[PDB]
Amino acid sequence: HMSASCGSGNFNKTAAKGVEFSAVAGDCIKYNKSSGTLQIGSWTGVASSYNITSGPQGITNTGNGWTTVANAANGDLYIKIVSASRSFNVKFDNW
Numbered sequence: 001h002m003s004a005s006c007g008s009g010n011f012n013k014t015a016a017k018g019v020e021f022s023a024v025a026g027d028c029i030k031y032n033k034s035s036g037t038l039q040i041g042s043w044t045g046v047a048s049s050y051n052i053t054s055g056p057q058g059i060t061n062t063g064n065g066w067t068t069v070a071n072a073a074n075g076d077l078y079i080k081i082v083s084a085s086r087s088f089n090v091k092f093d094n095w
């Protein structure tokens with residue numbers, strides 16, 4: 001239960017715009033969104049869900065395309081991977 005929160009003091013990975021990386025349930029990802037609307041994409045086929053610290057909660061992705069996340073702030077975002085059955089490749093983007 002310790003360090004279950006996700007934020008600027010305990011993120012374990014940093015995403016680069018448009019660059020896929022291997023992700024697992026429990027990860028806490030830092031991503032800077034400069035402008036536009038956040039997008040979360042994966043093609044591995046593994047369903048996943050996310051909470052953004054101080055932002056949108058219960059985001060889901062099917063593993064077969066992009067999820068658009070309206071109302072995510074610009075700047076540094078901290079995105080917790082709430083659930084996923086196995087490691088999967090994901091990318092964060094914005095447009």
Ligand SMILES: OC[C@H]1O[C@@H](O[C@H]2[C@H](O)[C@@H](O)[C@H](O[C@H]3[C@H](O)[C@@H](O)[C@H](O[C@H]4[C@H](O)[C@@H](O)[C@H](O[C@H]5[C@H](O)[C@@H](O)[C@H](O)O[C@@H]5CO)O[C@@H]4CO)O[C@@H]3CO)O[C@@H]2CO)[C@H](O)[C@@H](O)[C@@H]1O
Binds near residue numbers: 020043044
């Ligand atoms: O990675 C392994 C995995 O890849 C699968 O392939 C994926 C691929 O990874 C994805 O990148 C690709 O997804 C693309 C989307 O289909 C497409 O909609 C989106 O396009 C964006 C575009 O990048 C963006 O610039 C654009 O913005 C404009 C705004 O809309 C305007 O309002 C604004 O005014 O101007 C900007 C331009 O400055 O928006 C569009 C949407 O409108 O781009 C994605 C890529 O960046 O999909 C592939 C699958 O379909 C592959 O299939 C798997 O095999 C593989 O394992």
